[PDB]
Amino acid sequence: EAPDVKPWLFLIKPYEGESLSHFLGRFRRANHLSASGLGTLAGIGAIVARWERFHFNPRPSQQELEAIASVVEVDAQRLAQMLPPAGVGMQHEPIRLCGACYAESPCHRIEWQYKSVWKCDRHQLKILAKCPNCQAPFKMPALWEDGCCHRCRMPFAEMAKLQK
Amino acid sequence: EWLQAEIARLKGKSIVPLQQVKTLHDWLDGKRKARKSCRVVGESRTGKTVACDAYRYRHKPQQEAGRPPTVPVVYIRPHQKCGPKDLFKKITEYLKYRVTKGTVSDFRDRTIEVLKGCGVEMLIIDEADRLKPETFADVRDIAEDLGIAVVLVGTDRLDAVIKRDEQVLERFRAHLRFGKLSGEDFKNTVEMWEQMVLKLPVSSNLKSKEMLRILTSATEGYIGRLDEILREAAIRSLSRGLKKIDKAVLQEVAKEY
Amino acid sequence: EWLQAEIARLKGKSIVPLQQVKTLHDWLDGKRKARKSCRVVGESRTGKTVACDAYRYRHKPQQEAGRPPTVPVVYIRPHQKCGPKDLFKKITEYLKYRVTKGTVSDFRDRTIEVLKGCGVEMLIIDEADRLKPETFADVRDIAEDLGIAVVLVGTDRLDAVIKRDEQVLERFRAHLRFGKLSGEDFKNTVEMWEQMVLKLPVSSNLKSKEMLRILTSATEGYIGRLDEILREAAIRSLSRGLKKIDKAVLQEVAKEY
Amino acid sequence: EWLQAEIARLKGKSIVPLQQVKTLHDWLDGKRKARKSCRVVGESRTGKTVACDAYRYRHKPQQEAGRPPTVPVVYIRPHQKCGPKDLFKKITEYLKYRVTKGTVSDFRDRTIEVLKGCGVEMLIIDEADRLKPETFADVRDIAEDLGIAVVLVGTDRLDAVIKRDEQVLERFRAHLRFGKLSGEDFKNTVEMWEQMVLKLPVSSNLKSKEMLRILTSATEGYIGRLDEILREAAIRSLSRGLKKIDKAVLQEVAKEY
Numbered sequence: 048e049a050p051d052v053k054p055w056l057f058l059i060k061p062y063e064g065e066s067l068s069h070f071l072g073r074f075r076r077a078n079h080l081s082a083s084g085l086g087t088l089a090g091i092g093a094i095v096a097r098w099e100r101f102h103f104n105p106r107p108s109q110q111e112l113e114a115i116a117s118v119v120e121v122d123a124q125r126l127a128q129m130l131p132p133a134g135v136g137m138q139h140e141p142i143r144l145c146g147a148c149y150a151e152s153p154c155h156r157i158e159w160q161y162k163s164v165w166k167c168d169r170h171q172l173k174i175l176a177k178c179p180n181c182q183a184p185f186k187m188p189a190l191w192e193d194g195c196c197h198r199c200r201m202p203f204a205e206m207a208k209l210q211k
Numbered sequence: 212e213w214l215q216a217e218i219a220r221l222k223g224k225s226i227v228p229l230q231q232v233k234t235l236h237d238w239l240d241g242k243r244k245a246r247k248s249c250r251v252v253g254e255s256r257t258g259k260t261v262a263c264d265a266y267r268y269r270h271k272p273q274q275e276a277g278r279p280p281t282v283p284v285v286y287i288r289p290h291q292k293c294g295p296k297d298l299f300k301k302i303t304e305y306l307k308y309r310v311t312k313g314t315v316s317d318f319r320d321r322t323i324e325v326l327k328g329c330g331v332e333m334l335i336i337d338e339a340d341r342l343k344p345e346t347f348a349d350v351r352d353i354a355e356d357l358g359i360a361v362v363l364v365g366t367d368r369l370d371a372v373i374k375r376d377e378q379v380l381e382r383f384r385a386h387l388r389f390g391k392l393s394g395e396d397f398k399n400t401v402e403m404w405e406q407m408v409l410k411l412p413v414s415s416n417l418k419s420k421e422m423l424r425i426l427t428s429a430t431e432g433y434i435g436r437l438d439e440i441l442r443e444a445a446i447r448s449l450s451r452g453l454k455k456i457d458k459a460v461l462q463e464v465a466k467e468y
Numbered sequence: 469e470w471l472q473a474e475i476a477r478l479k480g481k482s483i484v485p486l487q488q489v490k491t492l493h494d495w496l497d498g499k500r501k502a503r504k505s506c507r508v509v510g511e512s513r514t515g516k517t518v519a520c521d522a523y524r525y526r527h528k529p530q531q532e533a534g535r536p537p538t539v540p541v542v543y544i545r546p547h548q549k550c551g552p553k554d555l556f557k558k559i560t561e562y563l564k565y566r567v568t569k570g571t572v573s574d575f576r577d578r579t580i581e582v583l584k585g586c587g588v589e590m591l592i593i594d595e596a597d598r599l600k601p602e603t604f605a606d607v608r609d610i611a612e613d614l615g616i617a618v619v620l621v622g623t624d625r626l627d628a629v630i631k632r633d634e635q636v637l638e639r640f641r642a643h644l645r646f647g648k649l650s651g652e653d654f655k656n657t658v659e660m661w662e663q664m665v666l667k668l669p670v671s672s673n674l675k676s677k678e679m680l681r682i683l684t685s686a687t688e689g690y691i692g693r694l695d696e697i698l699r700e701a702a703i704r705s706l707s708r709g710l711k712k713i714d715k716a717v718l719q720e721v722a723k724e725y
Numbered sequence: 726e727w728l729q730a731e732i733a734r735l736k737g738k739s740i741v742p743l744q745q746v747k748t749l750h751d752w753l754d755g756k757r758k759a760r761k762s763c764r765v766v767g768e769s770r771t772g773k774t775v776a777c778d779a780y781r782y783r784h785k786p787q788q789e790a791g792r793p794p795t796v797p798v799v800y801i802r803p804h805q806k807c808g809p810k811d812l813f814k815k816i817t818e819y820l821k822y823r824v825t826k827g828t829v830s831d832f833r834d835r836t837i838e839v840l841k842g843c844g845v846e847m848l849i850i851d852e853a854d855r856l857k858p859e860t861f862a863d864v865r866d867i868a869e870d871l872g873i874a875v876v877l878v879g880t881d882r883l884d885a886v887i888k889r890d891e892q893v894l895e896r897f898r899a900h901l902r903f904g905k906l907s908g909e910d911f912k913n914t915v916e917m918w919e920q921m922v923l924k925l926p927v928s929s930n931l932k933s934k935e936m937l938r939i940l941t942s943a944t945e946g947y948i949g950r951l952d953e954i955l956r957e958a959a960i961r962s963l964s965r966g967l968k969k970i971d972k973a974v975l976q977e978v979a980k981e982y
């Protein structure tokens with residue numbers, strides 16, 4: 048062993064509005080974990096691959112968030128802030144993006160999936176629901192490694208000027 | 212009972228500050244400073260493992276909570292027929308990185324990231340002749356892709372294995388030779404063992420010409436045989452109520468070799 | 469402290485514009501222009517990797533608005549025993565694409581469309597003898613179906629594996645040999661190291677016959693031995709407070725080889 | 726110091742441009758131009774090996790910018806009982822290629838490959854009597870299938886080995902005889918050693934009839950005896966503080982033969 052070392056893992060700081068799908072994707076990339084791997088590591092199994100698609104029948108339970116809060120050092124109350132608050136309706140399929148936010152903070156925001164959200168009040172821009180250059184839909188936020196459209200390679204920060 | 216505590220002490224292991232150890236450590240400091248890959252070679256039981264194991268404590272980690280530890284020297288002994296995945300497991304388990312499952316590709320990528328994140332500068336591979344010939348490619352890539360001095364340790368069997376792959380041969384050709392003890396160095400070591408290791412109630416005077424003659428014949432200069440003979444001789448002496456290693460007890464032990 | 473910055477420099481690598489490198493670059497330009505597959509072969513530590521790697525830096529990618537980047541030359545080094553899917557992943561990841569799921573056929577197909585999407589014209593596979601035998605079939609397909617100058621790099625081990633598939637032997641028939649240094653060219657490389665690499669405050673006259681003698685015996689013409697010897701000798705000399713390499717330090721280094 | 730520098734020089738070897746060396750070189754140049762195989766035969770220590778070394782140094786490899794070298798003359802000395810794989814390994818390593826692990830057939834085909842492309846015109850096999858009888862078939866095939874002048878070198882023991890196989894005998898029928906020195910040629914050779922080899926501060930006057938008498942009795946015309954007597958006599962003389970060889974020291978050495 049390395050003497051006086053504590054068993055450790057690569058951590059990531061969650062951004063102020065980062066979605067759980069985006070967060071788990073970064074944590075998985077930081078540790079080169081497959082989606083099945085993190086679920087086995089937390090012991091919740093295939094559930095992680097389901098959450099990364101925003102498939103929330105059922106929602107992330109107290110048990111499973113506290114389980115993920117054992118391998119991720121982020122506490123379960125902060126993990127619950129990566130999800131819609133109680134009774135806020137959300138949509139999983141059309142993945143959406145502000146772009147002007149992504150130039151400031153490279154994360155998907157869970158509020159971009161709310162059924163009540165359509166503009167960024169900070170930027171006063173209509174949030175995108177597909178790539179404005181090539182019309183390809185955005186991939187699940189767990190897969191936003193490159194920070195660009197997977198088809199035409201336009202960076203999300205440039206898509207800010209193609210909004211509203 | 213006092214006897215049970217002396218046996219519990221004598222059956223154990225200790226590190227004596229031999230000049231051979233000092234010579235290796237100063238040499239490793241230069242190789243670590245230059246990040247040069249090299250090999251340590253010497254016949255069996257000459258103290259290579261103990262001297263290399265002593266070097267990692269001399270560079271013990273520093274860590275902050277929620278961070279990878281700073282670990283300048285990694286030491287691993289692979290198991291026999293170590294393939295690349297087991298190599299990556301040994302490294303990440305030494306650094307106590309928590310991910311123990313995944314493909315060889317994940318284990319490679321996590322290992323290179325862990326080595327970089329922990330700031331490793333020297334990797335010591337003890338009994339490196341246990342590595343499979345295909346896994347030396349990953350060892351070479353650690354030394355090339357990262358600024359890491361890789362140190363291969365083994366017996367002359369390692370010199371044979373390295374010559375079968377020119378790419379390893381031309382990377383690891385700087386070497387240190389571990390020697391057996393002889394002459395006055397052996398006589399000096401025998402008296403250090405009595406005073407630092409055995410610490411029996413009464414002086415055995417192993418330094419004496421006749422005791423030194425027995426030890427010289429039985430040890431052949433192997434430090435492993437010196438330690439194993441003198442500790443067992445002490446344990447036998449103490450168990451029969453002697454206060455010192457007697458001639459007859461040392462001869463009883465020596466005639467087992 | 470001044471010493472720390474020089475040691476931190478001397479432990480690092482640098483690129484020297486040797487005529488051996490210029491020869492490959494002009495030759496690779498001909499094979500790329502003619503869109504011709506070929507191979508690069510030479511003994512270990514002759515500098516093949518550094519010359520090929522320098523060539524990739526000489527032709528960094530280019531971009532246009534709302535278009536993927538264009539990447540004139542791709543340089544990859546497979547991991548040992550590279551299977552087809554991991555070669556596609558290597559190429560895909562170099563082009564910054566990602567492919568999380570698929571059959572090997574799907575990885576192949578995605579590779580073909582991203583290669584032609586970025587319009588690459590030369591693919592250099594360094595240590596191509598790490599490819600699995602079947603992976604050369606897919607390498608052959610990528611060469612023919614798209615018209616990429618595939619450049620295989622290796623030691624004489626690469627020639628030994630290429631002789632085992634007639635179709636690989638046929639399309640990679642053209643080759644360049646990396647030689648070792650010799651004669652006045654070795655001497656010129658020694659002085660290029662003194663002034664363009666070592667840069668120590670006082671000259672060492674390593675170009676002198678008595679220095680060239682020990683250097684020739686220790687280096688034997690391998691540019692990797694030359695670099696590793698002189699950098700350690702410089703680091704050792706500065707650690708001793710010397711302003712230069714001394715013959716005695718150069719002897720102390722050369723004794724290890 | 727003077728003495729140790731002079732001793733270190735005299736201890737060594739050097740090449741003197743004797744007429745019999747030039748005679749062989751012009752003959753080998755004819756045979757190489759014609760690609761005619763032949764043999765060189767002469768008594769032990771008559772200088773055959775040095776003259777063959779001098780030839781391949783006058784016809785060393787030529788570089789052509791990333792091509793394999795053009796190497797018109799290959800010189801090998803087989804180890805005792807040289808089998809075919811040993812022979813192929815000798816040839817391949819001379820051409821600066823590493824022998825990859827494989828069968829005799831792989832070694833043959835690789836050797837045949839690199840004898841072409843390197844443009845080898847002449848292969849000199851010194852101590853050709855060390856070849857196993859089955860190895861001569863592969864030597865004959867190199868001469869037959871490539872246009873290569875193979876030169877077998879040996880003593881009269883070679884002329885007996887060759888006559889045990891008509892197919893070898895009939896191919897290497899043309900020969901040159903290396904002779905011993907005598908007469909005026911020996912007197913000139915002694916003069917040249919004094920001036921060009923020993924280079925003592927003071928003239929040893931080895932042309933003198935009394936000195937020639939000693940030298941002729943002990944040397945018996947063998948250039949090997951001439952060299953190794955005069956060097957040892959010079960080393961003995963300098964060690965005694967003499968600045969030349971003298972008759973007493975020369976007789977003291979010559980008495981041991």
Ligand SMILES: Nc1ncnc2c1ncn2[C@@H]1O[C@H](COP(=O)(O)OP(=O)(O)OP(=O)(O)O)[C@@H](O)[C@H]1O
Binds near residue numbers: 224253256262
């Ligand atoms: N510095 C030391 N201080 C005390 N005991 C030592 C020391 N070095 C060696 N020994 C004794 O010798 C034994 C053998 O030493 P060690 O394990 O280091 O040998 P080795 O050279 O690595 O052998 P091998 O090549 O056979 O694996 C130790 O277990 C210990 O009993």
Ligand SMILES: Nc1ncnc2c1ncn2[C@@H]1O[C@H](COP(=O)(O)OP(=O)(O)OP(=O)(O)O)[C@@H](O)[C@H]1O
Binds near residue numbers: 513514515622
């Ligand atoms: N052009 C160069 N400029 C400076 N240093 C060089 C150059 N070429 C080689 N070196 C030195 O020699 C070392 C070995 O060179 P390189 O990595 O290119 O080896 P290689 O020929 O690809 O060998 P192998 O076939 O064993 O992988 C380098 O890491 C560097 O220290």
Ligand SMILES: Nc1ncnc2c1ncn2[C@@H]1O[C@H](COP(=O)(O)OP(=O)(O)OP(=O)(O)O)[C@@H](O)[C@H]1O
Binds near residue numbers: 880953
């Ligand atoms: N041209 C020469 N110049 C200087 N010394 C020479 C020369 N030729 C021979 N010698 C001396 O004679 C010694 C014997 O010569 P050499 O090795 O060439 O003999 P050889 O004919 O190949 O003998 P053998 O058949 O016994 O192997 C040399 O090692 C050297 O000391």
Ligand SMILES: [Mg+2]
Binds near residue numbers: 140141
């Ligand atoms: Mg819908």
Ligand SMILES: [Mg+2]
Binds near residue numbers: 260338
């Ligand atoms: Mg050991």
Ligand SMILES: [Mg+2]
Binds near residue numbers: 516517518594
């Ligand atoms: Mg290389």
Ligand SMILES: [Mg+2]
Binds near residue numbers: 774
């Ligand atoms: Mg000879």
Ligand SMILES: [Zn+2]
Binds near residue numbers: 145146170
């Ligand atoms: Zn916004």
Ligand SMILES: [Zn+2]
Binds near residue numbers: 178181196200
């Ligand atoms: Zn797009």
